[PDB]
Amino acid sequence: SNSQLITKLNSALQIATKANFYKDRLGNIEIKSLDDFSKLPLTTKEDLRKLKPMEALTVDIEDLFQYHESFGTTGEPVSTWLTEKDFNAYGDQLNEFGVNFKSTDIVLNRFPYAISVPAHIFTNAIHKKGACVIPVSKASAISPLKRVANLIYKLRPSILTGIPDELIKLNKVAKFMDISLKDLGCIRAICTAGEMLSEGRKAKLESIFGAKVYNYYGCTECGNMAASCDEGHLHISKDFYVEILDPVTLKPVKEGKGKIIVTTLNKEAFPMIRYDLGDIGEIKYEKCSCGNDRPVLIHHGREIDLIKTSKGTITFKELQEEIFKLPNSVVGDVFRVKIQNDEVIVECEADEELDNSNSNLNLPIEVKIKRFNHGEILNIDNLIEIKPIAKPKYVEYVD
Amino acid sequence: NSQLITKLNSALQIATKANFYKDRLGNIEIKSLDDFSKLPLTTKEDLRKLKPMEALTVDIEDLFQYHESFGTTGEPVSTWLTEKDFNAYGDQLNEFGVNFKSTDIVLNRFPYAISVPAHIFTNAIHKKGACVIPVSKASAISPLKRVANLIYKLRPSILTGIPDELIKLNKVAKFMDISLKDLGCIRAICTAGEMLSEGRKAKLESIFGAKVYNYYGCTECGNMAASCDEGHLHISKDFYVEILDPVTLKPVKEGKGKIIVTTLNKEAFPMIRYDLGDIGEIKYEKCSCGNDRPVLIHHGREIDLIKTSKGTITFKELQEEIFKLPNSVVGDVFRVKIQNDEVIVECEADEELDNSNSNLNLPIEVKIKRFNHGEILNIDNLIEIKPIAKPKYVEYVD
Ligand SMILES: [Mg+2]
Ligand SMILES: [Mg+2]
Ligand SMILES: [Zn+2]
Ligand SMILES: [Zn+2]
């Protein structure tokens, strides 16, 4: 049934248009098809920024339950009220695919509970299956990586969750503490989210931790649009309608990569009608061997993370996919990307310098691997510090 | 008493599931509070020596949350919780305290990192249908400047945070030309995690123009007590509180003493006669609030006692007298130095006090040393905003 999906898209509009923002550019216009839908104006990040938090609201103050934002201080941020239902929906989305949380599971939650949502909805999800949350958080004086390393050694949790960046550092700090988190033999699964994950970097994470990885694709304003199957592919949540548009035309593509627009099927506080995530990807419709009937998504990363020389363009994913076919000797787990004077330079902490003259990348553009020394791009001494913290110290005996 | 005694016994029967408690309590029953008071105290330093699996009376399946001493300075105390237990903690916050309505938007300035107050306040607030703004604390993500803007923008109806932070919040905000009081949106405050004199409570109320509710709790127990409308803490029904003599360690007949607590309603690892290391006293005069539960007077930590040769006072008693002085000579920023057998209170304030004819109505000598605003507490340290964003892996050069 398109009949259902179309019923839903319409509901979403009827709620949305409770709010000035949505009414003064969608009125009471109904729709009869996806194509008639695709005629409707996109909703941009920069649109929502201009909104007071009371302008980003389709429910009564009474139904408010949580609040969230852009964690980033760089750029005006986006109010995202949630009702209990909405919050609970987000959580269910994490459970819809992803790893199978058991009650016997103890889960180290390394996502920031400060203002972001992934921390909170993962908790929601995990509690739902009867498992235990260790609220370590992130970017808190309270829980630097040394402590997290000790926490894992001590508590032996069965699942780690954290943005793949932090998880790579965690393993570095821990290895500098003479701890192989992998050999503990207690971590069966990982939950990455908050940055795009190549199959190459996913396979890196799996080799480090010796665990299966489940990746979760979401955002504050929407919820969690997709997550990994056992086979490794993201799948799209039933609570969303995902379109792939052409960067320039802004029309549905016939196939292949494109801008990722999402509409909320199941969020009532302020629904996302055709929201421009600003990412790149593609929906496949071949049924995954996992057996799940929902459609697979290939995430190519953010739009600004496209690699554009004169001689072509590639997605950050495509770049990464090729980087990480090279040995760890030449690439490693710490890298950044400079595009300058019409060349692509990947700077990598690694032991060996690469031929480059015999690099033999299978990309439509030229990419060089510039070698660095471990610790030069990522300073380990910055991560190992522990600030002592406690309650205020008001009463001093000078003895 | 038959109820309370039934409960104390249950607590022991669970507790002794754990070697820690069994190898010093066996299956000993009790018939009275007095027979209870014969049992060995449980100390902070006791629990520290426990592996997290040794601090556990339930199966891994029933585990739900985990927590610790937030400080990275000093070995920490494992505190598992089951869903029930967590839910109990929350209910304790709701048992007295402020009355959370569904029309309430609450800025939650407690750290969600490892501590519990942040999480159980959320629990409580959701329970009444109100909205949580999870600002947290000690996170790069949420410096005071942002919190000030967040309040200006979202106009929340309730702030929650340790009174120290809340005093700073108002400083940072006032330096940003924002009077949080004149917003007209904050009706209530929820202090916790440090002791609160009636004088400092009244200070907070003057700053924010809101009523204060204080909450007295700890990670291992839950939240043992919270304020009534009248101002007085009351003890939660989920706990048995004793006041012991500092030296003898026997029930006192009346007055101040060491505060020991037993968990009536926590099953993962119950606190049997736990030494908080605080000082206080139970009154049984009924508060005019009409709540029948007994009032508690919190005097602060033991190490925060003021001991000269010429006597001794509680941090509260000291504070209570400090803050009867004009605002001109005592503000909201103070510290306490005891040196060469004198008590010096250093205060940011405009006027110097005529200590040569000082009022102070205490059994010991206490001098008020005047300082300039911003010299004890540097506002410039707090106004910084650290830029944070996702990782930045792709750079276009030039
Ligand atoms: Mg469990
Ligand atoms: Mg509400
Ligand atoms: Zn699949
Ligand atoms: Zn009362």
Residue numbers in the entry:
A (entry chain A): 3 to 401
B (entry chain B): 4 to 401
Sentences from the paper on this structure:
ClxA therefore presents as a possible biocatalytic tool for the synthesis of pharmaceutical-type amides, particularly those that use anilines as the amine partner, as these had proven to be poorer substrates for the amide bond synthetases McbA12,13 and ShABS14 studied by our groups previously.
The observations on both chemoselectivity and substrate specificity of ClxA prompted us to initiate structural studies as a precursor to structure-guided mutagenesis. Two datasets for ClxA were obtained (SI Section S6): The first was an apo- structure with no ligands bound; the second was obtained following co-crystallisation with both ATP and 3,4-AHBA 1 and features the ligand density described below. The structure of NatL2 and ClxA are characteristic of a subset of adenylases in which the active sites are completed by reciprocal sharing of an extension to the C-terminal cap domain. ClxA, with only 29% sequence identity to NatL2, features many local differences in secondary structure compared to NatL2: for example, NatL2 features a longer N-terminus and C-terminus and an ordered helix (P373–R388) that is replaced by a shorter region of less well-defined helical character (D353 to N362) in ClxA.
